[PDB]
Amino acid sequence: SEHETRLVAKLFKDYSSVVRPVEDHRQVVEVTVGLQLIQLINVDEVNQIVTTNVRLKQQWVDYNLKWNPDDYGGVKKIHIPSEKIWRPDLVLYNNADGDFAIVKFTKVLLQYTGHITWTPPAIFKSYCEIIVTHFPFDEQNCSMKLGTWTYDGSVVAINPESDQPDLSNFMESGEWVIKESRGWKHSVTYSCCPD
């Protein structure tokens, strides 16, 4: 226990959560993002709002949180409050009336390599273009758009953990069957700024 206390003290003595966790500011923070769908809570056809319970797994390397395991008795991983570290500010762009960003700040898992894994729970009320023509035999292609709100792709780069959302924990809905799911990474360039 004393080893882990010493480690946590040594790491955060002069840590800063404002700067990006890179050796040089010209580097890009590589964040790996993976959506896990736990439950399809509701589909609101009149308001076009879909309520879902998800885990938004995020992984990145913090260059400053490395340590040598033999200095601390072989401690290879520790859990620390996510409020202390730098975090990607992923926002649900197409939020209807829910929380835009993560608000349940669970603890992250920090490994001696500086690899951080964060899997905060969130309830996403994504806006969906409900098509009602074939009601009640309709198929709804509802989507969730996740991106860093303020960081751009030349500063922080997000990559999908897998081509499809993780449904291994999905609770079966009594009203809807998920026929297909897929994740796509989109990059867009604007006439202001080629780079």
Epitope: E2, R6, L7, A9, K10, L11, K13, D14, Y15, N64, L65, K66, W67, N68, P69, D70, D71
Partner: antibody, heavy 120, light 107 residues
Framework: EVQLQESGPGLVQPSETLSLTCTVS????????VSWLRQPSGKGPEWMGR???????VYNSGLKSRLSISRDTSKNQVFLKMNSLQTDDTGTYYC??????????????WGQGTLVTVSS | DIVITQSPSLLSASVGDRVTLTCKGS??????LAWYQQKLGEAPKLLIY???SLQTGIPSRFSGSGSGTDYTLTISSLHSEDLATYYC????????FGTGTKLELKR
């Protein structure tokens, strides 16, 4: 300015406790960690343990049971005790001052080193 | 722990020659490799750390380079004072030291 002097019994019989002292000059033990290195004859050095600035200690996992380290901040000395010596423990012993960057540590200054020989 | 090997074991060189020393790990050392100089009966002296950074008061003759698994120490102009044994060591995953290379005068 910064100097470390290693001293102690150069000839030690097997099965009796080795003791070594490191004398520090030019810096305070409350601001710099001190670590002990061992170099068996005919081999590259190895790391044995560290006296932390906060007053705690850490040891090589193979030597964890054998080694004991302590310090006296009032006289700038670091002490090492080691029992159950064998002929394989013959070598040169260095105390070092350690730099830090965040949680990472490395050795920046060495003592002159004391030779310890174990023979019947 | 990461195993480290050095080559050559002995290097014969003459004053003023460009001389370079190779240190090679068994795993990614991530630029956390350091070089120190040792002389017979003298206290070893740190030359380079983080693969690139001179220790204060070391002559600018010494410069290090490398990334990933392979690292080098280079002396721009060998002086007679530089004949010594050079050890590389890494400090991200345990502490492991190379076998050392002995730098000796060509004759």
């Amino acid at each position: 300015e910064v100097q470390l002097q290693e001293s102690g019994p150069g000839l030690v019989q097997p099965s009796e406790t080795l003791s070594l002292t490191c004398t520090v000059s030019g810096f305070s033990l409350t601001s710099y960690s001190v670590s002990w290195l061992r170099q068996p004859s005919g081999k590259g050095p190895e790391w044995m343990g560290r006296m932390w600035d906060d007053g705690g200690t850490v040891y090589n996992s193979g030597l964890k049971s054998r080694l004991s380290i302590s310090r006296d901040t009032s006289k700038n000395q670091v002490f090492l005790k080691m029992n159950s010596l064998q002929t394989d423990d013959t070598g040169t012993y260095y105390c070092t001052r350690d730099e830090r960057i965040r949680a990472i540590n490395w050795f920046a200054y060495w003592g002159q080193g004391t030779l310890v020989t174990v023979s019947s | 722990d990461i195993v480290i090997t050095q080559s050559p074991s002995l290097l014969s060189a003459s004053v003023g020659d460009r001389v370079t020393l190779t240190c090679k790990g068994s795993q990614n050392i991530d630029n956390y490799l350091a070089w120190y100089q040792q002389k017979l009966g003298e206290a070893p002296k740190l030359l380079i750390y983080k693969t690139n950074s001179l220790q204060t008061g070391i002559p600018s003759r010494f410069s290090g380079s490398g990334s990933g698994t392979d690292y080098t120490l280079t002396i721009s102009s060998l002086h007679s004072e530089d004949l010594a044994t050079y050890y590389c060591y890494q400090y991200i995953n345990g502490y492991t030291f190379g076998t050392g290379t002995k730098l000796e005068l060509k004759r």
